[PDB]
Amino acid sequence: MIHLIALRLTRGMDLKQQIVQLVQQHRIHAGSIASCVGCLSTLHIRLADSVSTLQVSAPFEILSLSGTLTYQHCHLHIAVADAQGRVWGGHLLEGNLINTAELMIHHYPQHHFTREFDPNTGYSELVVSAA
Amino acid sequence: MIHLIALRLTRGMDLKQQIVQLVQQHRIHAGSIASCVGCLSTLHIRLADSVSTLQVSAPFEILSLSGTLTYQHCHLHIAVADAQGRVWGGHLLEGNLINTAELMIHHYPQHHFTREFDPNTGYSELVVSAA
Amino acid sequence: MIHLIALRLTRGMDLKQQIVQLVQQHRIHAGSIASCVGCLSTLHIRLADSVSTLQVSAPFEILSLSGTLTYQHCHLHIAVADAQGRVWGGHLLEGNLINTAELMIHHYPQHHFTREFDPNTGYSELVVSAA
Ligand SMILES: [Zn+2]
Ligand SMILES: [Zn+2]
Ligand SMILES: [Zn+2]
Numbered sequence: 049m050i051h052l053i054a055l056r057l058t059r060g061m062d063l064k065q066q067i068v069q070l071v072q073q074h075r076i077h078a079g080s081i082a083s084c085v086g087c088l089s090t091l092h093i094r095l096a097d098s099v100s101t102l103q104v105s106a107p108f109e110i111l112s113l114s115g116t117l118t119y120q121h122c123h124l125h126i127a128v129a130d131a132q133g134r135v136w137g138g139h140l141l142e143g144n145l146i147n148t149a150e151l152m153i154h155h156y157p158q159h160h161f162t163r164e165f166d167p168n169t170g171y172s173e174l175v176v177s178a179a
Numbered sequence: 180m181i182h183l184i185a186l187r188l189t190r191g192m193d194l195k196q197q198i199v200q201l202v203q204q205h206r207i208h209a210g211s212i213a214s215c216v217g218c219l220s221t222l223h224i225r226l227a228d229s230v231s232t233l234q235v236s237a238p239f240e241i242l243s244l245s246g247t248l249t250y251q252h253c254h255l256h257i258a259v260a261d262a263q264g265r266v267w268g269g270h271l272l273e274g275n276l277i278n279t280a281e282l283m284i285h286h287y288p289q290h291h292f293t294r295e296f297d298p299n300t301g302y303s304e305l306v307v308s309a310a
Numbered sequence: 311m312i313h314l315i316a317l318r319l320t321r322g323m324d325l326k327q328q329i330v331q332l333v334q335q336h337r338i339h340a341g342s343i344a345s346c347v348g349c350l351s352t353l354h355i356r357l358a359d360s361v362s363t364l365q366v367s368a369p370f371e372i373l374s375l376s377g378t379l380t381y382q383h384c385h386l387h388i389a390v391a392d393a394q395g396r397v398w399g400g401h402l403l404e405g406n407l408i409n410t411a412e413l414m415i416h417h418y419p420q421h422h423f424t425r426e427f428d429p430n431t432g433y434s435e436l437v438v439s440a441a
Contacts, residue, residue: 050181050312050416052287054209056305078316080345080414082285083211083245085256087227096349096369096393107227111258111268112243112374112389114345116412123412125347127243127258127268127373127389127397131227135258135266135397137373137389148297150247150254150305152211154181154344156314166410174318174412181312183418185340187436213416214342214376216387218358238358242389242399243374258374258389258399262358266389266397279428281378281385281436283342285312 050154057149064140071117078159079117086110086149091128093138107131116174118161181285188280195271202248209290210248217241217280222259224269238262247305249292312416319411326402333379340421341379348372348411353390355400378436380423
């Protein structure tokens, strides 16, 4: 059965760090982000070329946060909107500071997500199994 | 156990109003938006500076809708794409009119979300409790 | 009870085709996209005017994927970010090729989603029923 874990984050908290801590705290071995309405005072993302990075200290509304949660690694992608309504996004890094964040995580106790090195990509990739 | 509530919205309906009505109708005290594929004929959002607003009467595809649902308040953020594929988004206001909208809401009967004034923000913020 | 189906997609796979195949394989008559963190080497979307289309062969990070899943039809909308962090999106078409894609689908065994022609729109639209 899918379980819900909800938590409000406050000013100054690091989004990615808080999610990783929540995952470890609840012994989550398989999960995803259900919702994350909120705002940031600092955005820090890795871009689509997998190398460039963007850090901006300005107000951003969090529109969506998607993530594959495993105990040892959280793969999170975010979409945010700036003061003009334009949307930006990419791979979530450390340093994304909350300005509230109404975080909701879905935990899948019956599953076990892990990550194993993939010679074809050069990165550790998702491996799905039953728990 | 997480429950699903699905509803197709039709031309002219107000997105936010329909969600609020659904929440009250089903006595939802804790929930989130599972999905909302569809399109709008009018977009109306509050921007990241928390004051500016954008209203546009043009076709927009709804890409994602995230929300913290409580009986007395729905905090919704939307991401939409215009005719050129560019994405815009922000805090959902009244006035977002459906052009279909395939709405799916997740209800958490075991939880109770409320909102209490936060002197540190000046707004009512999410408070999570067990139901 | 909501069920989770997770699958990692690899290089060259067609996103929409893989989702349709998963839906048919698991006899899903009602479902939605829970998460889809990943990246594409080719983007192909129908835009908000419901006619224009954009196909781009460049790296894109998948930020969010929303979809109404029925056995005979999957209505999917995607939001992706380019190498500069700018977000683009629209109605998912065939031809969106994976560069990984950590796909998670939620199946609703107690529901039955179908699509029936709507004279008011000219398209087949979502009809929700109990299973
Ligand atoms: Zn990534
Ligand atoms: Zn907001
Ligand atoms: Zn569509």
